[PDB]
Amino acid sequence: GSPEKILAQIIQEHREGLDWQEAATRASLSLEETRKLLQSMAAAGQVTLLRVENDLYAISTERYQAWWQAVTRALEEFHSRYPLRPGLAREELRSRYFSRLPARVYQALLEEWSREGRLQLAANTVALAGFTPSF
Numbered sequence: 001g002s003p004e005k006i007l008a009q010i011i012q013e014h015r016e017g018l019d020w021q022e023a024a025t026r027a028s029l030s031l032e033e034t035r036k037l038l039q040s041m042a043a044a045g046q047v048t049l050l051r052v053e054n055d056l057y058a059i060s061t062e063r064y065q066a067w068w069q070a071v072t073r074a075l076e077e078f079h080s081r082y083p084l085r086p087g088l089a090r091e092e093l094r095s096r097y098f099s100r101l102p103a104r105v106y107q108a109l110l111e112e113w114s115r116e117g118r119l120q121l122a123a124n125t126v127a128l129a130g131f132t133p134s135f
């Protein structure tokens with residue numbers, strides 16, 4: 001198939017996403033070409049781009065959106081069941097839905113969702129934005 005189809009399949013099939021350089025290598029593409037294709041896939045709403053430390057990851061947008069829907073439901077349910085607790089253990093959420101991700105990528109996702117106003121983070125726990133303990 002064409003180089004663009006090869007790259008698209010690499011990213012869309014990848015269950016955690018991957019360093020864009022790794023994707024370039026797997027597709028036998030230059031960085032230039034990989035970047036330009038990623039920019040059009042991002043414009044089409046197909047790929048999510050995430051900096052992780054000094055690396056850049058390309059992730060299927062469908063996968064990323066499905067992660068968020070799992071997280072918000074789990075936290076909604078947790079806050080309903082246990083409204084006095086400050087949040088769910090970060091490591092428990094990781095083990096539920098993110099066990100194949102590198103830990104640093106999981107942390108970058110939590111920090112992104114917090115920045116966006118979706119979450120609030122403590123050192124060990126995670127909660128929905130605006131949640132406060134009560135009875």
Ligand SMILES: [Cl-]
Pocket residue numbers: 017018019022
């Ligand atoms: Cl990778």
Ligand SMILES: [Cl-]
Pocket residue numbers: 029030031032
């Ligand atoms: Cl290159």
Ligand SMILES: [Cl-]
Pocket residue numbers: 064065068
């Ligand atoms: Cl989302």
Ligand SMILES: [Cl-]
Pocket residue numbers: 097098099100101
């Ligand atoms: Cl996983």
Ligand code: NA
Pocket residue numbers: 048049050
């Ligand atoms: Na992004």
Ligand code: NA
Pocket residue numbers: 054055056
């Ligand atoms: Na790097």
